[PDB]
């Protein structure tokens, strides 16, 4: 941008991710379900595809931490802010930091990864912090009941589908 | 940047200062990319008697460069309105991010007036 790094959207539609490490609170076999399930959602709204790495450098570098952990922002140790992204760009760009030292579920008894990272990945793909306390993009952790009956808020679909269009 | 708030007290336990405030100006990159800092005038100080304050020596509250990775947003039409600001410090200064205790003083329960003034800090230690 302007001052720091980042362009305002990905200048291509296939985008590529890898999830670096894992958090030892999920089998890793679970951790695969809430990311993809998490990067569906945006797929759904858009002519967006996602192709999973295991090795080099992909566009969103998903990964866990703890305190300091690379970047200019550590973590908060347990509670408070639970994970952070980056807008699309080169490099450090795209990519998902998550705290480990919360307490990630896949389920309604904890903090839900599919949750956080669909919301997390808004933001590497473009979107900023909603309002609408309905909208996912909304920093808030309001975490639902029955994970079955979770939806985008009309308002994020206008949002992303303002940068990507809707699907062809 | 996603995030579970703080109940109050948790926010004046884990917090170094608890200052009231109102946002004296917009937010401008200072001697940093990463952060950005509102101009604040201090009024009343609930917490961190280690670091003095007294009317204006907390003159900046820092926060994050861009609300992604955190960075709080403040958009309120009367300057002299008046704000709980719950936040950490770094180095010797105030940080502030999308989930620290930020509400204007006046929304505040009796409640939780009385709680940042007197009773928080009775639960912190345990």
């Not at chain 1, 919301?119 to 979107?127: A, N, T, V």
């Amino acid at each position: 941008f302007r001052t720091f790094p980042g362009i305002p959207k990905w200048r291509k539609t296939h985008l590529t991710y890898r999830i670096v490490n894992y958090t030892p609170d999920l089998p890793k076999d679970a951790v695969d379900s809430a990311v993809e399930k998490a990067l569906k959602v945006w797929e759904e709204v858009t002519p967006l595809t996602f192709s999973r790495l295991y090795e080099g450098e992909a566009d969103i570098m998903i990964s866990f931490a703890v305190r300091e952990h690379g970047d200019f922002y550590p973590f908060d140790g347990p509670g408070n802010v639970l994970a952070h992204a980056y807008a699309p760009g080169p490099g450090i760009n795209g990519d998902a930091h998550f705290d480990d030292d919360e307490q990630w579920t896949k389920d309604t008894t904890g903090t839900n990864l599919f949750l956080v990272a669909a919301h997390e990945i808004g933001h590497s793909l473009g979107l900023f912090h909603s309002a609408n306390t309905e909208a996912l993009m909304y920093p808030l952790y309001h975490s639902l009941t029955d994970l079955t009956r979770f939806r985008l808020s009309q308002d994020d679909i206008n949002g992303i589908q303002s940068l990507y269009g809707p699907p062809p | 940047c996603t995030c579970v708030p703080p109940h109050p007290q948790t926010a004046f336990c884990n917090s170094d200062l608890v200052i009231r405030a109102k946002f004296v100006g917009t937010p401008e990159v200072n001697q940093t990319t990463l952060y950005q800092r509102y101009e604040i005038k201090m009024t009343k100080m609930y917490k961190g008697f280690q670091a003095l304050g007294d009317a204006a020596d907390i003159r900046f509250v820092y926060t994050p460069a861009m609300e992604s990775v955190c960075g709080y947003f403040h958009r309120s039409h009367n300057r002299s309105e008046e704000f709980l600001i719950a936040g950490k410090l770094q180095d010797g200064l105030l940080h502030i991010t999308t989930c620290s205790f930020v509400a204007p003083w006046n929304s505040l329960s009796l409640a939780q007036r009385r709680g940042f003034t007197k009773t928080y800090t009775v639960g912190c230690e345990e």
